[PDB]
Amino acid sequence: EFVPPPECPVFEPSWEEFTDPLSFIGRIRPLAEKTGICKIRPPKDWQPPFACEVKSFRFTPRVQRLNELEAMREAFGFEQAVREYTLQSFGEMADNFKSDYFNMPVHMVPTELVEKEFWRLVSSIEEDVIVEYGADISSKDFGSGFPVKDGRRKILPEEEEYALSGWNLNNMPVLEQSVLAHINKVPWLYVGMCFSSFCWHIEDHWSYSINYLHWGEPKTWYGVPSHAAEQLEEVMRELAPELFESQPDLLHQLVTIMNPNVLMEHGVPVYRTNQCAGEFVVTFPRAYHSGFNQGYNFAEAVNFCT
Ligand SMILES: Cc1cc(Cl)ccc1COc1ccnn1-c1cc(C(=O)O)ccn1
Ligand SMILES: O=C(O)CCC(=O)C(=O)O
Ligand SMILES: [Mn+2]
Structure with missing residues (x-):
């Protein structure tokens, strides 16, 4: 059965340390760049409101067959009827799926059990589990x-500090320096289910x-430090399907699913974490x-530059 990788670093900045994100990330870099990912827990009283327009939030999530690579069927290409959800109806679907799958209330399922089952299902040819991801x-x-102080939605006075915070992902620096920048990005959202x-x-x-x-x-999360990037890429090339081996990286990354234990057996360092509500993960x-x-x-996620 799946062997959990060692835990990545978790930081709990004081209010002083929490002042500037780029300064803080710069200071933790000597350790965190050696693990690839780290988790940051804000001070306990830092609790931003949820500011999405919930009433009108509608989306068509994409369908994910966990074992599609291992499986490499009559009328393939039509494996799933298409479904549009609201935030509420997706959540109802998501909770019903998980409680039915594990036969227990969703919050009683141990994180280690979901992890073991996920990786079992990814390699399983005997059962096809299909989920959806917004x-x-x-x-x-x-x-x-x-x-966000853009005048599209009301901000209460006690919420303005979060609109102005450097840890608000809309306030992260995103402009890369270049010559072209002198001659001539927003966050993205992820609605998950089990x-x-x-x-x-x-x-x-x-x-x-x-x-x-x-x-x-x-x-x-699973993360690999940058010093092992070429090692991971070599393991991928050795073990990825031949048909996808020659593909450019930007396309191969659409289908680069690989059990962390396989990477660890080939000597790639892998760290894990469970990111809980209200916590940040930084990737280096x-x-x-x-x-x-x-x-x-x-x-919510964004790429930023230093
Ligand atoms: C296009 C797409 C489709 C599906 Cl089904 C899933 C992910 C994506 C893109 O995801 C990403 C692109 C760049 N980073 N990134 C990403 C996503 C997550 C996350 O899902 O929480 C975490 C960390 N990085
Ligand atoms: O496209 C996918 O389904 C894989 C998700 C991902 O992170 C990627 O595309 O690199
Ligand atoms: Mn990413």
């Missing part, structure tokens, strides 16, 4: 989960990324990462 929804569509997942990838331009879980059940430049959701949740 992934990569633009914060321009229904707003960011953070309050087993919905993201496969191994790095960011465009080897960017940092930061990720905030607004609410819901945890998001389970060229740090490969992947993960899955434990249940119904809502995350």
Whole structure:
């Protein structure tokens, strides 16, 4: 059965340390860049409101067959009837799925059991589990989960500090320095359910990324430090399907699912974490990462530059 990787670093900044994100990330870099990912727990009283337009939040999530790679059928291409949800109806679907799957209330399922079952299902040819992921929804569509002082939605006085906070993902620096910048980006949202997942990838331009879980059940992460990027890529090339081996990285990353224990057996260092509601995850430049959701949740993410 699955062997959990060692835990990545978790930081609990004081209010003083919590003042500036880029200063804080710069200070923790000597350790966190050696693990690829780290988790940051804000001070206990730092609790931003949830500011999305919930009434109108509608989306068509994408369908994920956990074992699609292992399975490489009559009338393939039509495996699933298409479904549009609201935030509420997706959550009802997500909770019903998980409680039915495990035969217990959703919050009673141990995170280690969901993790073991996820990786079993990914390699299982005997059972096809299909889930849905509201992934990569633009914060321009229904707003960011953070309050934003753009005049589209009311901000209460006690919420203004969150609209102005440097840890608000809309206030992260995103402009890369370049000559072209002198001659010539917003956060993205992820509505998760149990087993919905993201496969191994790095960011465009080897960017940092930061990720905030607004609410819901945890998001389970795996990260690889940048010093092992080429090692991971070599294991991928050895073990990825031959048909996808020659593909450019930007396309291969759509289907680079791989059990962390396989990477660890080939000597790749892997760290894990459960990101809980109200916690940040930072990924460092060229740090490969992947993960899955434990249940119904809502995350926001952006690439930033230093
Ligand atoms: C297009 C897409 C579709 C699906 Cl089904 C899933 C993920 C994506 C893109 O995901 C990402 C792109 C760049 N980073 N990134 C990402 C996503 C998560 C997360 O899901 O929480 C975590 C960390 N990084
Ligand atoms: O596209 C997918 O389904 C995989 C998710 C992901 O993180 C990626 O595309 O690199
Ligand atoms: Mn990412």
